[PDB]
Subunit: 231 residues, 3 copies
């Protein structure tokens, strides 16, 4: 395990996701409100899935070698397995907060699936120049998602409770900033142009992942917006 | 890319799915009705997914070699990845049109999953005679789906709005004819008996795919059946 | 096929799932009640999926070799493909019976996904001692599911119809006993410590699978709890 310099960040990531999972699990024990239960379920599952995939990367299972540029390049494929399930759960948290219509939710989840799926294909593609074609398609799917979060959701939040409108606005802003960093790190890291070494890349993704999951969850689950308006 | 004679049909397929995706995306921009949004979301996602998988076939990612009959046989596995997601979306379009009950929808999607999954296993099976066992099981799942579309849905459409009944009937008929061709092409093509060469097989699937997705979508999204009855 | 001593149990399993599938399919033909249709759909799909995966194991497709302990160890990976889809369907049968809230259903299905997914990783892991780390995480996800079935569902059933409360209690008890055997068989069988040989392991899983699917389904589909209260 320690044979890879990036192991320290995989281990820290595993620990922080594990701790985040346990914290949300305990916190949600005292919850009976049916609406709050939905948000706790979604939000606890996110770091639990990430915990398993960080562990698989730490132990070496979630790593494969991909030939491109005349080299055997270490590619952590387990990231995409994580993201396939956790990024639509994160979007679902946002969509339920603002009572999004079903068509909009399906558009978001579908675009998200395309985003992660094409990122996976790009990560595993052996023809170097083609990796960036997949990156571009994935990034276009991301831009669609960000567009919807701003010009379909923000003006939906404003007709809702003030506490859900303010909580949505904060989580929207956190999401757009954090999620936009992922394609940049991929592009300059070992999957793309290879300018930033894998150990630093792994650190960067770990900070983004913990912030986008445990950070996000801490903000959401401390808000009164997750509860039905009750006396 | 041009090293494979079937590349021209993969390229045309990619282009037509891409163009179809953009057309539906633009067309649905001016839509606020919650019901119509569902149909636009579902129907736009279908060629978008197909676009990505056609591209993966064009670039060579979605192709593998399978030993059977003492030969290395080129198998485009990306078709099944496409179909796994797009065929239940197509069925969902039909089921929502007639306000199908939840049990019926689950039966359809489940049978569809079995249909595509067993087709994939058959496509990748190395014992030649066993490929046709999987083809038979998949075809039985197809026949179940077609049965339900006729003797569970058609008489559901007739108690609904005339515009939804007439639109459903047309899309049902398009679906049954087009979908029934797929097992025949598989059986006589490079996956099955090998009587029709891969380049012609690829052409045939491209015509079926564009018709079943973009053709289907053009009929559906031009109907007033996708809108709630409103003043 | 007969080259593997466990083939007889794979063949019997295939037959019993096939027969169970046909029986439930015929039985549900005379059903119009929308609630009952849901239970028939879910419950018929379960042995149908299991039939396909038992067949893939019989024909040899669903088997791979995994190096650990200095040996090539036969691992039937198709079990996890089965279980990935059938165990959440089984939980859905239980959850719908007691009209579980959406948050609880998502927690169950999510924990179940983690349970099966980590079992799959453990089954395919090449470092022997690490296989048991994945077994432990999977078992913890199982224990969560069993906890919810007892201390979240049982007291939900009691405020419902007596026929649904009594049917739920029986199916809950069947589920907890049968499902708890699976991690034990894995641990002592060819995936784990290797004390029980593969042919006996295969027998054990076949008895558990038929009981947990066809047995379970026979109890559920003969109950009046699956019908809406109607005059
Ligand atoms: C009911 O609605 C609220 C339940 O949501 C909360 C439900 C949770 C989503 C349940 C899912 C967590 C499972 C219990 C997962 C089990 C293994 C976990 C990964 C635990 C890992 C952390 C520990 C090992 C440090
Ligand atoms: C509604 C939304 C969910 C829409 C989803 C959007 C989605 C369509 C976007 C594209 C997804 C698609 C790229 C998934 C591809 C998975 C694939 C990378 C798995 C690895 O297999 C690739 C090659 C080795 O590189 O296998 C070597 C050759 C092997 C023989 C491969 C044969 C097995 C195939 C992988 C079977 C395909 C199954 C499905 C792709 C399962 C989807 C997995 C998940 C990653 C989407
Ligand atoms: C809101 O409900 C309506 C939105 O549906 C319409 C929503 C669409 C389903 C959004 C999904 C499309 C994504 C934007 C996919 C991005 C890449 C596409 C494959 C674009 C490819 C076509 C172009 C490259 C020729
Ligand atoms: C409700 C509905 C959805 C019901 C669904 C119906 C469904 C049950 C029908 C059968 C689906 C099942 C056949 C999927 C099999 C996928 C498999 C072909 C992927 C390729 O792996 C096959 C061999 C190489 O040929 O791998 C070589 C050996 C490797 C070590 C394989 C180990 C990895 C396994 C593939 C893990 C299994 C994961 C699940 C099958 C994911 C499902 C993928 C999708 C195609 C259904
Ligand atoms: C409508 O709601 C009730 C339908 O549920 C019942 C619907 C069923 C879930 C339909 C799914 C079964 C498909 C017809 C599967 C076809 C192949 C089967 C595996 C048949 C195998 C058994 C036989 C070959 C012995
Ligand atoms: C809401 C709930 C559903 C939550 C779900 C919980 C879930 C997160 C729990 C963990 C699931 C995760 C372990 C699935 C891993 C599948 C993996 C074993 C498939 C086989 O690939 C493993 C190695 C060979 O051993 O591939 C060799 C290297 C290859 C290059 C691998 C590259 C292809 C990757 C497999 C692509 C990943 C796609 C997704 C994992 C699809 C999920 C399949 C299913 C088994 C969950
Ligand atoms: C918890 C993990 C999260 C929130 C991950 C988010 C990841 C993305 C938004 C990834 C986006 C990518 C692209 C837009 C193109 C390049 C490849 C990706 C997959 C890194
Ligand atoms: C957009 C793509 C569509 C509508 C594809 C439909 C495909 C089928 C109905 C495929 C059916 C098959 C069988 C019935 C058995 C042989 C294998 C298949 C998968 C080709
Ligand atoms: C129809 C099949 C059923 C009901 C299978 C149930 C399987 C399980 C509950 C498996 C549990 C496992 C663990 C808890 C850890 C070890 C690995 C598994 C996957 C066997
Ligand atoms: C969105 C953030 C992307 C920028 C990442 C900056 C990383 C700077 C680290 C120094 C680069 C290491 C190069 C020498 C090894
Ligand atoms: C459902 C349509 C299946 C029939 C396809 C007919 C294809 C005819 C093309 C000629 C066959 C090529 C054989 C000589 C290369
Ligand atoms: C939950 C049941 C697990 C116990 C399984 C008992 C199997 C006993 C069979 C005898 C073991 C075979 C060892 C000699 C080959
Ligand atoms: C490819 C995996 C996509 C599914 C991820 C799980 C999250 C799905 C959330 C469903 C949202 C509800 C839509 C109506
Ligand atoms: C194996 C992939 C199956 C899922 C495909 C996505 C479409 C699912 C549509 C869900 C229909 C709603 C059922 C209640
Ligand atoms: C990884 C596969 C998980 C999906 C299995 C299919 C069963 C899903 C049942 C959905 C229950 C409804 C939740 C709201
Ligand atoms: C186009 C929608 C406006 C809100 C999205 C902001 C786009 C940020 C760009 C992210 C950088 C990705 C490379
Ligand atoms: C049995 C249901 C009647 C409607 C379905 C028509 C079946 C068409 C056969 C398709 C050919 C597949 C090989
Ligand atoms: C902790 C919840 C109480 C009900 C679950 C009973 C646990 C049975 C243990 C199963 C054995 C697995 C190794
Ligand atoms: C070796 C790099 C070749 C450049 C490929 C860039 C493709 C980016 C596509 C953006 C439309
Ligand atoms: C080499 C071909 C052997 C014939 C197999 C046909 C099987 C079809 C099954 C239909 C019930
Ligand atoms: C070779 C076996 C080494 C023992 C591993 C047991 C790990 C079990 C983890 C339970 C917390
Ligand atoms: C990680 C295993 C958890 C089993 C005990 C249940 C914890 C309490 C959860 C309350 C919903
Ligand atoms: C509760 C702490 C969980 C941390 C387990 C994984 C950390 C890796 C240590 C090497
Ligand atoms: C908008 C046109 C999209 C076409 C891109 C793929 C066509 C392949 C050209 C070689
Ligand atoms: C209807 C009987 C189904 C049995 C088919 C599979 C049994 C395997 C026989 C070798
Ligand atoms: C993006 C950083 C999130 C910070 C989380 C802090 C949570 C405290 C309530
Ligand atoms: C099956 C062929 C479909 C033809 C689509 C034409 C759409 C015009 C409205
Ligand atoms: C766990 C054993 C189940 C027994 C099923 C018998 C069904 C008869 C109604
Ligand atoms: C990591 C366990 C958290 C302890 C409880 C925190 C207050 C709910
Ligand atoms: C008003 C919300 C500001 C949140 C910005 C957080 C940036 C990481
Ligand atoms: C809305 C601001 C987006 C900031 C992008 C930051 C990418 C590192
Ligand atoms: C391909 C872009 C379509 C242009 C608009 C067509 C009329 C909505
Ligand atoms: C009355 C509907 C006829 C549609 C037939 C289309 C055949 C491709
Ligand atoms: C309902 C008519 C079906 C026609 C099947 C055509 C197969 C090529
Ligand atoms: C296996 C076929 C079952 C025959 C009908 C049983 C009574 C519904
Ligand atoms: C009162 C229900 C008892 C069911 C026990 C079944 C054990 C297999
Ligand atoms: C509730 C009793 C569980 C029995 C476990 C049996 C495991 C073989």
């Amino acid at each position: 395990i320690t044979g890879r310099p990036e192991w320290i960040w995989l281990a820290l990531g595993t620990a922080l996701m594990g701790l985040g999972t346990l914290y949300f699990l305990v916190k949600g024990m005292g919850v009976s409100d049916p609406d709050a239960k939905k948000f706790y379920a979604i939000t606890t599952l996110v770091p639990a899935i990430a915990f398993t995939m960080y562990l698989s990367m730490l132990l070496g299972y979630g790593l494969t070698m991909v030939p491109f540029g005349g080299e055997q390049n270490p590619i952590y494929w387990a990231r995409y397995a994580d993201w396939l399930f956790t990024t639509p759960l994160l979007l679902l948290d946002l969509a339920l907060l603002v009572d999004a219509d079903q068509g909009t939710i399906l558009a978001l989840v579908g675009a998200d699936g395309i985003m992660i799926g094409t990122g996976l294909v790009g990560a595993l593609t052996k023809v170097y120049s083609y990796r960036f074609v997949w990156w571009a398609i994935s990034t276009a799917a991301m831009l669609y998602i960000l567009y919807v979060l701003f010009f379909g959701f923000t003006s939906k939040a404003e007709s809702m409770r003030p506490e859900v409108a303010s909580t949505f606005k904060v989580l929207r802003n956190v999401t757009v900033v954090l999620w936009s960093a992922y394609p940049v790190v991929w592009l300059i890291g070992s999957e793309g142009a290879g300018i930033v070494p894998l150990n630093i890349e792994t650190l960067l993704f770990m900070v983004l992942d913990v912030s986008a999951k445990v950070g996000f969850g801490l903000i959401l689950l401390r808000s009164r917006a997750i509860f039905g308006e009750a006396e």
